[PDB]
Amino acid sequence: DVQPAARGSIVDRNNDRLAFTIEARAAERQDLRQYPGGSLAANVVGGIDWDGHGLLGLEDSLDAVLAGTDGSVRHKAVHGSTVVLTLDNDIQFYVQQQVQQAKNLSGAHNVSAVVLDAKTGEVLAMANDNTFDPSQDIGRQGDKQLGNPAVSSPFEPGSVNKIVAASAVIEHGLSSPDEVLQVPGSIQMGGVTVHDAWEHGVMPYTTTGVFGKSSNVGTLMLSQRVGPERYYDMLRKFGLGQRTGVGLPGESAGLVPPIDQWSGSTFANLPIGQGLSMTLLQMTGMYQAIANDGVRVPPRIIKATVAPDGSRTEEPRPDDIRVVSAQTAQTVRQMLRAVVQRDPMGYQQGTGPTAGVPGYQMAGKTGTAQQINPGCGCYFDDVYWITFAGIATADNPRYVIGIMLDNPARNSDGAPGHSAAPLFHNIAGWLMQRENVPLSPDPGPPLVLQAT
Ligand SMILES: *C(=O)[C@@H](NC(=O)[C@H](N)c1ccccc1)[C@@H]1N[C@@H](C(=O)O)C(C)(C)S1
Ligand SMILES: [Co+2]
Ligand SMILES: [Co+2]
Ligand SMILES: [Co+2]
């Protein structure tokens, strides 16, 4: 009497299969969910329950699309539609592996990474370490990551948030990359005292140097030019505090205190990335806006669906959001090249020189945010979220890469320190090689971070 719907498959952007059903035997007919890549993108894909319906991930959030409706004899069975993700399996595989070995080499509690297409915001890779294997019983995998922290688990961003301040001082004509500043080693602001990660007297940092060296004091002085209203407006325009609508279950909205609830010290904290939280995806989406000439395209992982006949419907594109002018975006892309600039004299070196890839105008920003002590209601002194976000490349944005390390003892590559810059180096360099993207013989002249 019953005519069963055949579950749809989940494939990547080139129709490479992530999950698909085969017919088998034991009721007697029994359909088996196949996961050829095992753990590949399982944080996104999810896994099957006993009855062949989704248990978690997109298998469950898109179950109705994937499961179809059973027929009867008279009503025809509607077989499940196929879901085409924006993921590129080759990129996801490389990224997911690097993320696992960044966690191993650095001693972090977790490591995650997101790769966006610069112009379109599509999610080309989304990975975390320790990813469960959906071809195996979930109940034996309590020691595994069963979910998708890149969208579900916000953190305080620290210094990667400085893109907002930088975008606001440029867009509002309030400063320029080459402006020579005078930056003390500390200031009192909003009732509190803010210090730079190194002690120094008044330093002739350019605006380029404030972000390339990640001066908190410098960021805040430039932020006083913007004011709370214009800065809070730029936060909101950058997408923070609000879900992206990427199409993944369990997405968090993060957390931005609204301006009418600020305390006297909120403005002293937000421009340096403390006092607010965001997801890795929101973090990478901020850099997507800048990569896309100031136009933010909310990220999306569902590319299209194919009906049982074979007809394809593309997913509807989200509307553009104008965060900053194209001129502003280009100027911020170029400033951020200072973060990867190397200088043996130290003077004109940014915080993330290991992130540069020679022959390419790489551009990014490091961060080191303090985590909250759960048994205190106060910040740890030596527990951090490490964070990197970058664009490949400044002069021709193709890829946006966002990385977070949960409190590593070492670099992502195992060298001493605490930086995520080596992992951006690995992934961005590999993305350029595999597309045979051409080098550039001249990098331009070095950027000036520090005047006289
Ligand atoms: C942004 O991430 C800033 N970090 C801080 O002010 C932290 N409170 C801090 C953590 C650890 C040591 C010193 C300060 C600046 N950006 C960092 C980075 O770009 O990696 C920094 C360590 C240069 S300070
Ligand atoms: Co009927
Ligand atoms: Co240390
Ligand atoms: Co290298």
From Swiss-Prot:
MF-aspect GO terms: penicillin binding
Q: Name one GO cellular component term.
A: plasma membrane
Cite the annotated pathway. Answer: Cell wall biogenesis; peptidoglycan biosynthesis
Posttranslational modification: Cleaved by Rip1 in response to oxidative stress (H(2)O(2)), prevented by Wag31. Cleavage probably occurs near residues 102-103.
> Topological domains (Extracellular): residue ranges?
1-452
Protein topology in the membrane: Single-pass membrane protein
**Any idea which UniProt keywords this protein has?**
Cell membrane, Cell shape, Cell wall biogenesis/degradation, Membrane, Peptidoglycan synthesis, Transmembrane, Transmembrane helix
What are the recorded Gene Ontology BP terms? cell wall organization; peptidoglycan biosynthetic process; regulation of cell shape
Cell location: Cell membrane
The source's domain of life comes to Bacteria
| Active-site residues annotated for this sequence | S159 (acyl-ester intermediate)
* Subunit architecture: Interacts with Wag31.
About its domains, the entry says:
The enzyme has an N-terminal penicillin insensitive transglycosylase domain (formation of linear glycan strands) and a C-terminal penicillin-sensitive transpeptidase domain (cross-linking of the peptide subunits).
Similarity section: Belongs to the transpeptidase family.
> What exactly does this protein do?
Synthesis of cross-linked peptidoglycan from the lipid intermediates.
Q: What is this protein called?
A: Penicillin-binding protein PbpB
- Which organism was this protein described from? Mycobacterium tuberculosis (strain ATCC 25618 / H37Rv)
What gene, per UniProt, encodes this protein?
A: pbpB
Which residues of the complete protein appear here?
Answer: 129 to 679 of 679
